[PDB]
Design a protein around this nucleic acid. Structure first.
Ligand SMILES: [Mg+2]
Ligand SMILES: [Mg+2]
Ligand SMILES: [Mg+2]
Ligand SMILES: [Mg+2]
Ligand SMILES: [Mg+2]
Ligand SMILES: [Mg+2]
Ligand SMILES: [Mg+2]
Ligand SMILES: [Mg+2]
Lengths: 76, 205, 78, 85
RNA sequence: AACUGAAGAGUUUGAUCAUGGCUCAGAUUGAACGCUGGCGGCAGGCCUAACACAUGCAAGUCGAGCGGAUAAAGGGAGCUUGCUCCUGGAUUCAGCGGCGGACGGGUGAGUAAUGCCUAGGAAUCUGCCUGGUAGUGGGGGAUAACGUCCGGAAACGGGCGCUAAUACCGCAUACGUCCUGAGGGAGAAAGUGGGGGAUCUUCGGACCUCACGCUAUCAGAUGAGCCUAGGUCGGAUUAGCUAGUUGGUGGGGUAAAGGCCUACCAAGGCGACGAUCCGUAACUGGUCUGAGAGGAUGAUCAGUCACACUGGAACUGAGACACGGUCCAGACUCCUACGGGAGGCAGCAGUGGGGAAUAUUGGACAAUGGGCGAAAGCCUGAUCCAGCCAUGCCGCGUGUGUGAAGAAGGUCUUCGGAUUGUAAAGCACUUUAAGUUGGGAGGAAGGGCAGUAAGUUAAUACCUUGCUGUUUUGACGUUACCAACAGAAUAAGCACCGGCUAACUUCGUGCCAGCAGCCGCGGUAAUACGAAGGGUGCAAGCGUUAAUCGGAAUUACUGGGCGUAAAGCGCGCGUAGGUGGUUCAGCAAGUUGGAUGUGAAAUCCCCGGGCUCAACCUGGGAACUGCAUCCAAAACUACUGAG
């Protein structure tokens, strides 16, 4: 289990925010829409930029509404 | 619920022989089957298109003696089985016990065979059956109970088997009165006056 | 505790039991862990009275399943 | 009612009063250590820590506090004595 | 084992084609009502006031935990038929304790969310069960009962005096446990019962053995608590919402991660992919229609959640913030000596009330199950069974044959007849169900007692286990089922008949009364109103009303439209978003194929098997369209690199 998204926020302290896109299909009209997903990955070293491409995985909860962490930065 | 009442009058509307009266005396002498019953037995003209399908369904339903709650129950078991619901609807009416007593020839009417079953006088596998709905299988040795083998209702009816012949899927023994249902009938021993393509179409709409 | 006991299915005056393994504080007809056989007292003709499978009964009885009074004999008479 | 619920009613205060004595005694031997930390006392807290470990653990196997709760005070209070060195 | 259906009609007009509404034919319900009414199987029965409740009963059990008081048989003596006392003691239960009342039964008020489904994972707990491992050493102080005093209308409360335990508390020891930094430090226990070779001794006892119980701990199952991701009704004439609010740090707190809590720090967080707010509603496996796609809907059965007169709150405990527990506040009934008390049928019956509308103050513990004791036994309004109600599905009767002078009798008529009609009558047979009499299984596994053989042992003493022998047990119950007797006797309605639509003529009535699902009939000849004959549909039922889905290609994904029938913004530019010319190369996110884990059981479907058949019950398979993890393929789309 390993996801991938891009960063939109650096405002908080040791906390980053990703967007994970997703193509689900519509159940009756047979068309693939795009619907988003927005998590709070636990940053660890205050070193990611707005516009990166990072990789997350799931741990036990660290604060509330923050259970995902940072694996590694893939590309700028 | 049976049908108790006049019995030429059913044969007199549909306009056929229909084999309801018992003896071989005469059709259209006890009956006078020339006309539609009732007062206005002379006026006729243009049976409706729905009325033709109901007239075919009511004909088959009065040869055998079912009612419609039972008759639609046979129609469900026809559409369950594989292929040719018209033929399957007939072969569930042939395997019924009151028909096979009539085919062996243990009665004059078909309604007489219903009464001989109903008074426990008929056995199927060596044990008593008194239900006029028992679906018999291939190879069931229908025999007559020994307490009533001396009834003249059965003895006289075997001379009424002379105007009938054997239907060539049974065999009857005129000494011990123990018939044997050999196999299922085919779609050649049944008369072509009944139609398997009007009753099926009636139960759609 | 877990236990091996008999359910009850069928009409009036014609029972048909089921060898189930259940947690003890459940209903009769409620939930169960799994089912392993049946028991038909009024079996006649081609019907089979006892139909226990010895594989899962080897498994559960080695882990503290606790049988009933009738099941004390039905596993015995196999 | 029953003559059996009225027995479990009388048998509740005889344990409520009994457990409260065994429960509050634990907390007095813990507040003696914590009030001795705040005055920056190295050997005063060390004496209180010694004669309060047997009081907590003897009240643990009686079944008053749970055994993982007694495992929690002993870890943290050691972490404040090594911070006075 | 794998498996198939799809119908139209009437109505806008002098008439026609089209667009478009409306209405009917179908299958269904926890149904209600009107007319009528023989039977048996299998089912179901407060959908409204979660509105109040008279009276019965629904969770207790252990004397192989310990006091105490009842004291049998019997051992008796004595005295003269009976008492006296004595001796043992079997019973028996108010009290302390161990367990259990957190399971089983009930109801749908609340909640638009992580409640409930599906897929995952990490930070924990778990009495009774199973497998192990190490034990089960000694000691003390109180307490109810019972005494006795005092107070209270009671419901009860208070004091002094006495005794016991597997109650309670120190002390001793301890891994294979906790904390610690290695080093070191800390913590437990309970005994009763059956026997007995030897020996100490009052085999009071020690003693050995067995059964049981208890204390640490690891593992397994079982149950439980948490977190993530997704899906989850209508309203945009609801567009901004939020300061433990959103993160960080330090400290607390809980079995367990966390603003769970607190102190400072920082100014964030969510929102048009619909936040917030309003309105309603318990969800799910499934049921009902449909050819299918879908559409409605969550009665009985099963899983999960939420409540127990209203609002709070914790204790006890393995596990409750607890339906027959505790405390408080309130409302409402009742008691009282006026001081004070008592109670909670959304357990099974039942009453009142509401309403179109919904059942007996039953029978038992025999079965399956639970609780305690394993020693039998004891409790059980959950269960298993009966009673009531055409409330539904499935089955069977209400006779069968012969019989034309074609009888009366009825209705109609061109007056000739036709029709009711072989239908009756007459004649010959038959007796299921109901009635009556006799017979009669299966649901029964055990328990007691006795005997015997195995292994426990120091002792085949006890006890456990095979087996033998003997004895005992059913609410249902007059059982299903079988035989005999009576005699055709015991047993048919309901709507409709102008068109859709199967089936028709006379008589009253005359724009009156009346009919009606739509078209619409009735003004003096009505096949439409009211009757009478006749006839057609269904039957132990038939009709109307209410309510869903079909037909409706009438919200059109499968499957429609926009020149004039309703329907193209007055025209531009443009953000989010949707779609992408052409060559290679890469990649594998879509896509196809396969494997594994899952998708509870039931239900539906297929092949069988049992009840005289069927409904009903039941064995094996398919299916549950899903989601996740792996393996491969590379045409097309996406992404990447070059043109
Ligand atoms: Mg359709
Ligand atoms: Mg009640
Ligand atoms: Mg018996
Ligand atoms: Mg009669
Ligand atoms: Mg009329
Ligand atoms: Mg449609
Ligand atoms: Mg533009
Ligand atoms: Mg299933």
């Amino acid at each position: 289990r390993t996801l991938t998204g891009r960063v939109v926020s650096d405002k908080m302290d040791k906390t980053v925010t990703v967007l994970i896109e997703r193509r689900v299909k519509h159940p009756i009209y047979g068309k693939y829409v795009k619907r988003s997903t927005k998590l709070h990955a636990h940053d660890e070293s205050n070193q990611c930029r707005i516009g990166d491409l990072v990789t997350i995985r799931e741990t036990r909860p660290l604060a509330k509404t923050k259970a995902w962490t940072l694996v590694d930065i893939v590309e700028r | 619920a049976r049908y108790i009442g006049p019995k030429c009058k059913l044969s007199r509307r549909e306009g056929t022989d229909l084999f309801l009266k018992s003896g071989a005396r005469a059709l259209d002498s006890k009956c006078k089957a020339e006309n539609v019953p009732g007062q206005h037995g002379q006026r006729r003209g243009r049976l409706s298109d729905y009325g033709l399908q109901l007239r075919e369904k009511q004909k088959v339903r009065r040869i055998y003696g079912v009612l419609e709650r039972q008759f639609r129950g046979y129609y469900q078991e026809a559409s369950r089985r594989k292929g040719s619901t018209g033929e399957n609807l007939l072969q569930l009416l042939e395997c019924r016990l009151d028909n096979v007593v009539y085919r062996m020839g243990f009665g004059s009417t078909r309604s007489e065979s219903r009464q001989l079953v109903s008074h426990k006088a008929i056995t199927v596998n060596g044990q008593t059956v008194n239900i006029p709905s028992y679906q018999v299988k291939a190879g069931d040795v229908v025999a007559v109970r020994e307490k009533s083998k001396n009834q003249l209702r059965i003895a006289q009816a075997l001379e009424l088997c002379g105007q009938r012949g054997r239907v060539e899927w049974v065999e009857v023994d005129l000494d011990k009165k123990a018939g044997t249902f050999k196999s299922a009938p085919a779609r050649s021993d049944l008369s072509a006056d009944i139609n398997e393509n009007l009753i099926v179409e009636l139960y759609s709409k | 505790m877990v236990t091996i006991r008999l359910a009850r299915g069928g009409s009036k005056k014609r029972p048909f039991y089921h060898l189930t393994v259940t947690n003890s504080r459940n209903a009769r007809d409620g939930r169960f862990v799994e089912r392993i056989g049946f028991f038909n007292p009024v079996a006649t003709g081609g019907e089979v009275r006892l139909s226990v499978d010895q594989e899962r009964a080897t498994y559960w009885l080695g882990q503290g399943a606790q049988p009933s009074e009738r099941v004390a004999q039905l596993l015995k008479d196999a | 009612n029953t003559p059996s619920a009225k027995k479990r009613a009388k048998q509740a205060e005889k344990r409520r009063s009994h457990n409260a004595s065994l429960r509050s005694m634990v907390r007095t031997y813990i507040k003696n250590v914590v009030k001795a930390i705040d005055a920056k006392d190295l050997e005063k807290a060390q004496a209180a820590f010694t004669a309060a470990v047997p009081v907590i653990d003897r009240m643990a196997d009686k079944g008053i506090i749970h055994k993982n709760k007694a495992a929690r005070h002993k870890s943290r209070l050691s972490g404040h004595i090594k911070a006075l060195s």
